[PDB]
Amino acid sequence: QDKVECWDRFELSFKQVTKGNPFDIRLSATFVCGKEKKTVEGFYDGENTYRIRFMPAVAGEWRYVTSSSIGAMNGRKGTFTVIPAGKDNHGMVLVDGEHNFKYADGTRYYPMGTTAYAWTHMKETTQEATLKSFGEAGFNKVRMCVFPKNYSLVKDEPALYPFEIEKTIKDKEGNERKEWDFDRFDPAFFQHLEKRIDQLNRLGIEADLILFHPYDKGRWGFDAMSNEVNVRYIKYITARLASFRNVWWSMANEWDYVKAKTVDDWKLLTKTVVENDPYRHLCSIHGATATYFDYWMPEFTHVSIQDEAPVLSSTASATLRKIYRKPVICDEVGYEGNLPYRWGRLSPQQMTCFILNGLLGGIYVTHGECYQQGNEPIFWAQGGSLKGESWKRVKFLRTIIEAAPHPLEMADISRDLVTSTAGPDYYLVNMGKDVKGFWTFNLPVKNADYNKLQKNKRFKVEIIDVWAMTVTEYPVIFETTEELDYRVFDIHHRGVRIPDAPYIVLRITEVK
Amino acid sequence: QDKVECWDRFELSFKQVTKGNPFDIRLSATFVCGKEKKTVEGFYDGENTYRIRFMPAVAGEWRYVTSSSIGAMNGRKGTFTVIPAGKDNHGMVLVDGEHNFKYADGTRYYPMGTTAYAWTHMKETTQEATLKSFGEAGFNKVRMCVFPKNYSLVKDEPALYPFEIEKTIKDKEGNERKEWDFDRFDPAFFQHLEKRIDQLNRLGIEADLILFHPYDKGRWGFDAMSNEVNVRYIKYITARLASFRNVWWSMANEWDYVKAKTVDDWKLLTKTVVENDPYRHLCSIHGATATYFDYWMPEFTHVSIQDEAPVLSSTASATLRKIYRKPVICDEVGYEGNLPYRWGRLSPQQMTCFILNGLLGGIYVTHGECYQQGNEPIFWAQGGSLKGESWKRVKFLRTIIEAAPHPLEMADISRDLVTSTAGPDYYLVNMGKDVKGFWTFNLPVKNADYNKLQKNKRFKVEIIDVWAMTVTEYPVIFETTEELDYRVFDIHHRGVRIPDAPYIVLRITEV
Ligand code: NI
Ligand code: NI
Ligand code: NI
Ligand code: NI
Ligand code: NI
Ligand code: NI
Ligand code: NI
Ligand code: NI
Ligand code: NI
Ligand code: NI
């Protein structure tokens, strides 16, 4: 492929016969463009075909040189041209300072994700439904498991598996049972995963890839493989996927429920991922409720947690930002649904409230939905169709947060529990769940690390009804007092008449 | 001193004339009792007197050997006997697992401290008043600055300073201005501090010693000394005080307001303390509101923070425990007082509520009070007399938490926001601030990492009115249902009639 865009993939392939196990063959290349130089591993893709993938990050005239344990694939050379990324290619998502994210091209990224753990393991018609739902919804990230999920309500047998089957046996309790050849991957499994990740990429969705998880417990045994096998898998999947710009590594979902693995195993596996990632994708690890790994380790780019506690209030979310000084994502806080399980029974309003709280506190929050309806797929695990109401409100919320000039944070942390800022003279004030008809115009004088709020400034107010998905301009222009006991009021003690409803947020901005 | 208790001090002293600066003289000793061996630094104490202090941690027949750059203090040997600690000597406070504390003898320690930043820098009658107040109150820790404090409402000139004065000059604006000889400590300043720390020890109070702070800003300059001086001071004060069992090191109060120091300076200064502490006292650092240092560094034993956010609810406190897996102390959350400043204007109720929230969530919380009244000393900075009401409630709260069989934690973290546990079948349920007359008997089935709450168990309820400082036995005995949607109820759907008041806690225990 002679011409590729910055942050797309350049791919080499070789047809080669091997005497032994082709998955043991060493293959790599070094890519050079002036001062830019990168060495990456290749992989075997079945049918006597080896591949090396590269994601160039600079435009120019590139060259490469291969290295292999097979002479015919060793010392192979060629060239290609890399052109600037096109308007909708922003590159990978990167950390931006201590709290936020940006695409590689400088474009702001706010993760507003959902959950579809085993959507790539369902029948084809369900997978197509899931893609349709992703196309309609406003989510720009999805938590998804590489390996299939065995769980309450999730019993569908996958059609593809990551390894070849060495043999099938009749088991302890009479039933059929596949024994894996852990030395041979099934390339079709990974090719399928790649097709889906690319489809997400075209929808603008980051694939938050869960590399390991506990949702197995002997059904297949992918949660209890040896560390030699775990490392071989990591090396293989990184060789295949590290060139895919929209991938994030999630080391685990509910790490502390994987009984075969110790904390030391997780540190080893994490280091292995990072060492085999030439491009430095985002990397974190998710735990049981209120379980916090050592996120301060340099391998991790951000915090990825299961805990509703930080989203019970915006201030609680804000504390986490100061503790970690890495971006914080509450990747699981409860899901909107009708399940008997306390993790899957939120009202759509509560789901929406938790996401709002985290956003306004300066963190990010992932959605999920799980409505059981006969034998229909349930989204959080299986994909299919979105049946709930909170997914509509997260789409509206994206429009709100993306319209602000900077990321959100508390204006006067720990002191004012309701006022967010997204810039100089740019506020979102949460009216809260205590229903009322009137809010006195009152702001902190402190505005995070922006300049203090000045006197004689004229502000307009917009009433944002988050549940109703509406923005209504208020006709009164407010005028700021001097600082008075850490606060700033309107000169005539005015306020805003609001609907007697929960989930009202006021957007207060300077009259231009 | 030929016979010493375990965790008391053995002290050597030598009379010696020195040609040069006596504060530059190298002096140390190695103490041995069988397999127990410790090497500690000595110090110059003025009047041609050098000292070496040691805190033995095991009973037996001890010996020592000194080392010095002065021949007469080098290779000196002797012996002493160490006996078991007496009934009220529990040793230093140590970390106990991920979340709690114990004295060295295994006795439980719950920090229920107060604040008196510059109490050792006041006139004598004020310092005696502060001692009397400490004796009456129930606090077992006090946050206190080594160096004097210059602040709004705190302008008293200290009588003693940590360094000799090289000269006094008429300054920019005409006034007198002391220039320090940073190469010579004033031993009297440190002797005074030691007297007070020992008095605290006899009261059962831990001296949480703030080594550096920003409350100076050029009045004296102790906040802007060179790192060479900072290190010399650290080495000196550790040599003097590391043997005092009731000391904790606080690297700073409001570290991030000390403009002359970078994060790298703080890491250096912290490593210097730890390298010069033969015994491993508690060590942390306090910041500005909602400022979190890298508490995960191994130098720190615990988290010491200024932030009311974690005590806004017990769940918020509980989250910090899981994050850090070191003990957590909200050492500053607002003070009860009448000041115009938002740090010093809590009601006594709110001060009490914050402390209760933290305790119930499994962390610890420090009190302060600051009532301005004419020119009278204001406790948070100057000591003197306690004028508020919350200090009475923290004393009652001690008796409650110490009566429980284990430390407190949430029974069903993040899911149940009101139920604390201190053991199997041992609950404190917070009724909250929303005033009501009745609580339906309802508990989680989960009980932290204890066994689940069983059916057919009989519970009594004690109504604890935290503000009124009363415990009242409720006459109904409740009996548990089976697990029903993660909860457990009373078999007859009963509950507890309670006072229509805030700050009611129910203590629920098996009959
Ligand atoms: Ni775009
Ligand atoms: Ni879960
Ligand atoms: Ni920050
Ligand atoms: Ni800007
Ligand atoms: Ni007017
Ligand atoms: Ni005692
Ligand atoms: Ni302060
Ligand atoms: Ni724990
Ligand atoms: Ni026990
Ligand atoms: Ni009965």
mmCIF file of N, CA, C and O in Angstrom, chain A residues 296-333:
data_model
loop_
_atom_site.group_PDB
_atom_site.id
_atom_site.type_symbol
_atom_site.label_atom_id
_atom_site.label_comp_id
_atom_site.label_asym_id
_atom_site.label_seq_id
_atom_site.Cartn_x
_atom_site.Cartn_y
_atom_site.Cartn_z
ATOM 1 N N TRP A 296 -1.325 4.737 40.099
ATOM 2 C CA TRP A 296 -0.141 5.600 40.057
ATOM 3 C C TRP A 296 1.031 4.954 39.312
ATOM 4 O O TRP A 296 2.005 5.625 39.002
ATOM 5 N N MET A 297 0.962 3.650 39.049
ATOM 6 C CA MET A 297 2.026 3.013 38.265
ATOM 7 C C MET A 297 2.086 3.719 36.903
ATOM 8 O O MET A 297 1.052 4.079 36.328
ATOM 9 N N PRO A 298 3.302 3.913 36.373
ATOM 10 C CA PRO A 298 3.445 4.682 35.112
ATOM 11 C C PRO A 298 2.894 3.981 33.902
ATOM 12 O O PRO A 298 2.508 4.646 32.939
ATOM 13 N N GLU A 299 2.702 2.665 33.976
ATOM 14 C CA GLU A 299 2.077 1.970 32.892
ATOM 15 C C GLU A 299 0.673 2.444 32.590
ATOM 16 O O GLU A 299 0.251 2.395 31.432
ATOM 17 N N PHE A 300 -0.055 2.887 33.607
ATOM 18 C CA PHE A 300 -1.418 3.306 33.395
ATOM 19 C C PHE A 300 -1.557 4.769 32.997
ATOM 20 O O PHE A 300 -0.961 5.635 33.612
ATOM 21 N N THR A 301 -2.333 5.031 31.954
ATOM 22 C CA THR A 301 -2.594 6.415 31.488
ATOM 23 C C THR A 301 -3.706 7.106 32.255
ATOM 24 O O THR A 301 -3.698 8.346 32.384
ATOM 25 N N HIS A 302 -4.618 6.331 32.822
ATOM 26 C CA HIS A 302 -5.829 6.870 33.430
ATOM 27 C C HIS A 302 -6.392 5.859 34.403
ATOM 28 O O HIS A 302 -5.938 4.696 34.473
ATOM 29 N N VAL A 303 -7.379 6.323 35.145
ATOM 30 C CA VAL A 303 -8.115 5.571 36.139
ATOM 31 C C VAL A 303 -9.437 5.070 35.506
ATOM 32 O O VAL A 303 -10.146 5.812 34.873
ATOM 33 N N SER A 304 -9.700 3.764 35.648
ATOM 34 C CA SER A 304 -10.893 3.108 35.071
ATOM 35 C C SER A 304 -11.529 2.284 36.189
ATOM 36 O O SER A 304 -11.066 1.218 36.485
ATOM 37 N N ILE A 305 -12.619 2.780 36.778
ATOM 38 C CA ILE A 305 -13.155 2.193 37.998
ATOM 39 C C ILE A 305 -14.624 1.809 37.922
ATOM 40 O O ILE A 305 -15.396 2.340 37.124
ATOM 41 N N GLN A 306 -14.937 0.771 38.720
ATOM 42 C CA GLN A 306 -16.306 0.399 39.027
ATOM 43 C C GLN A 306 -16.559 0.903 40.423
ATOM 44 O O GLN A 306 -16.104 0.310 41.384
ATOM 45 N N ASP A 307 -17.340 1.962 40.551
ATOM 46 C CA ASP A 307 -17.707 2.506 41.870
ATOM 47 C C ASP A 307 -18.704 3.620 41.668
ATOM 48 O O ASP A 307 -18.402 4.596 40.981
ATOM 49 N N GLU A 308 -19.907 3.472 42.221
ATOM 50 C CA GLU A 308 -20.846 4.604 42.138
ATOM 51 C C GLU A 308 -20.519 5.732 43.115
ATOM 52 O O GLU A 308 -21.016 6.831 42.972
ATOM 53 N N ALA A 309 -19.724 5.447 44.128
ATOM 54 C CA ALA A 309 -19.458 6.471 45.166
ATOM 55 C C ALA A 309 -18.984 7.810 44.610
ATOM 56 O O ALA A 309 -19.568 8.824 44.949
ATOM 57 N N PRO A 310 -18.003 7.800 43.699
ATOM 58 C CA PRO A 310 -17.533 9.107 43.163
ATOM 59 C C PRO A 310 -18.555 9.870 42.391
ATOM 60 O O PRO A 310 -18.414 11.102 42.279
ATOM 61 N N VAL A 311 -19.605 9.220 41.857
ATOM 62 C CA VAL A 311 -20.638 9.948 41.135
ATOM 63 C C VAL A 311 -21.884 10.237 41.968
ATOM 64 O O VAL A 311 -22.843 10.768 41.457
ATOM 65 N N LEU A 312 -21.837 9.967 43.258
ATOM 66 C CA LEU A 312 -22.943 10.362 44.122
ATOM 67 C C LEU A 312 -23.030 11.884 44.237
ATOM 68 O O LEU A 312 -24.050 12.388 44.606
ATOM 69 N N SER A 313 -21.926 12.557 43.988
ATOM 70 C CA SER A 313 -21.857 14.034 43.929
ATOM 71 C C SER A 313 -20.722 14.427 43.012
ATOM 72 O O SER A 313 -19.692 13.717 42.903
ATOM 73 N N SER A 314 -20.852 15.609 42.420
ATOM 74 C CA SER A 314 -19.753 16.151 41.619
ATOM 75 C C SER A 314 -18.461 16.400 42.422
ATOM 76 O O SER A 314 -17.347 16.229 41.889
ATOM 77 N N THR A 315 -18.593 16.823 43.675
ATOM 78 C CA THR A 315 -17.440 17.051 44.512
ATOM 79 C C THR A 315 -16.673 15.782 44.762
ATOM 80 O O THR A 315 -15.432 15.766 44.679
ATOM 81 N N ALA A 316 -17.376 14.665 44.974
ATOM 82 C CA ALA A 316 -16.713 13.405 45.151
ATOM 83 C C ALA A 316 -15.903 12.986 43.935
ATOM 84 O O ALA A 316 -14.812 12.398 44.080
ATOM 85 N N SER A 317 -16.432 13.278 42.754
ATOM 86 C CA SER A 317 -15.719 13.065 41.499
ATOM 87 C C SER A 317 -14.457 13.953 41.445
ATOM 88 O O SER A 317 -13.349 13.474 41.097
ATOM 89 N N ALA A 318 -14.643 15.204 41.819
ATOM 90 C CA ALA A 318 -13.550 16.198 41.776
ATOM 91 C C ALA A 318 -12.346 15.791 42.667
ATOM 92 O O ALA A 318 -11.174 16.030 42.303
ATOM 93 N N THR A 319 -12.634 15.184 43.817
ATOM 94 C CA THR A 319 -11.578 14.744 44.725
ATOM 95 C C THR A 319 -10.667 13.783 44.029
ATOM 96 O O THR A 319 -9.439 13.848 44.186
ATOM 97 N N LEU A 320 -11.254 12.811 43.285
ATOM 98 C CA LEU A 320 -10.433 11.848 42.573
ATOM 99 C C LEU A 320 -9.413 12.445 41.609
ATOM 100 O O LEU A 320 -8.303 11.907 41.446
ATOM 101 N N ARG A 321 -9.805 13.515 40.941
ATOM 102 C CA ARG A 321 -8.895 14.186 40.032
ATOM 103 C C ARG A 321 -7.617 14.692 40.736
ATOM 104 O O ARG A 321 -6.503 14.590 40.177
ATOM 105 N N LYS A 322 -7.797 15.232 41.952
ATOM 106 C CA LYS A 322 -6.701 15.753 42.738
ATOM 107 C C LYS A 322 -5.821 14.639 43.308
ATOM 108 O O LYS A 322 -4.613 14.800 43.391
ATOM 109 N N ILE A 323 -6.436 13.501 43.674
ATOM 110 C CA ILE A 323 -5.736 12.360 44.215
ATOM 111 C C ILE A 323 -4.801 11.728 43.187
ATOM 112 O O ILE A 323 -3.603 11.468 43.463
ATOM 113 N N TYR A 324 -5.329 11.511 41.992
ATOM 114 C CA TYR A 324 -4.597 10.715 40.971
ATOM 115 C C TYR A 324 -3.772 11.554 40.003
ATOM 116 O O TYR A 324 -2.703 11.122 39.565
ATOM 117 N N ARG A 325 -4.263 12.752 39.683
ATOM 118 C CA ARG A 325 -3.669 13.602 38.658
ATOM 119 C C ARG A 325 -3.372 12.823 37.359
ATOM 120 O O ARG A 325 -2.365 13.029 36.696
ATOM 121 N N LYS A 326 -4.303 11.942 37.010
ATOM 122 C CA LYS A 326 -4.453 11.264 35.728
ATOM 123 C C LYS A 326 -5.950 11.344 35.422
ATOM 124 O O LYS A 326 -6.775 11.503 36.362
ATOM 125 N N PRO A 327 -6.362 11.294 34.128
ATOM 126 C CA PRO A 327 -7.776 11.369 33.839
ATOM 127 C C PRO A 327 -8.522 10.238 34.577
ATOM 128 O O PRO A 327 -7.981 9.171 34.712
ATOM 129 N N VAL A 328 -9.723 10.523 35.075
ATOM 130 C CA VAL A 328 -10.551 9.555 35.796
ATOM 131 C C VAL A 328 -11.798 9.222 35.016
ATOM 132 O O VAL A 328 -12.551 10.121 34.592
ATOM 133 N N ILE A 329 -12.027 7.922 34.817
ATOM 134 C CA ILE A 329 -13.226 7.452 34.262
ATOM 135 C C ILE A 329 -13.902 6.473 35.221
ATOM 136 O O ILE A 329 -13.300 5.451 35.585
ATOM 137 N N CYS A 330 -15.129 6.786 35.627
ATOM 138 C CA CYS A 330 -15.995 5.824 36.298
ATOM 139 C C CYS A 330 -16.596 5.009 35.165
ATOM 140 O O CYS A 330 -17.612 5.380 34.567
ATOM 141 N N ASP A 331 -15.896 3.958 34.798
ATOM 142 C CA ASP A 331 -16.328 3.122 33.698
ATOM 143 C C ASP A 331 -17.513 2.226 34.017
ATOM 144 O O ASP A 331 -18.128 1.644 33.125
ATOM 145 N N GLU A 332 -17.866 2.124 35.280
ATOM 146 C CA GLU A 332 -19.065 1.395 35.678
ATOM 147 C C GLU A 332 -19.603 1.915 36.997
ATOM 148 O O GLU A 332 -18.894 1.890 38.030
ATOM 149 N N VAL A 333 -20.853 2.360 36.975
ATOM 150 C CA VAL A 333 -21.500 2.957 38.160
ATOM 151 C C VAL A 333 -22.896 2.423 38.425
ATOM 152 O O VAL A 333 -23.693 3.051 39.151
#
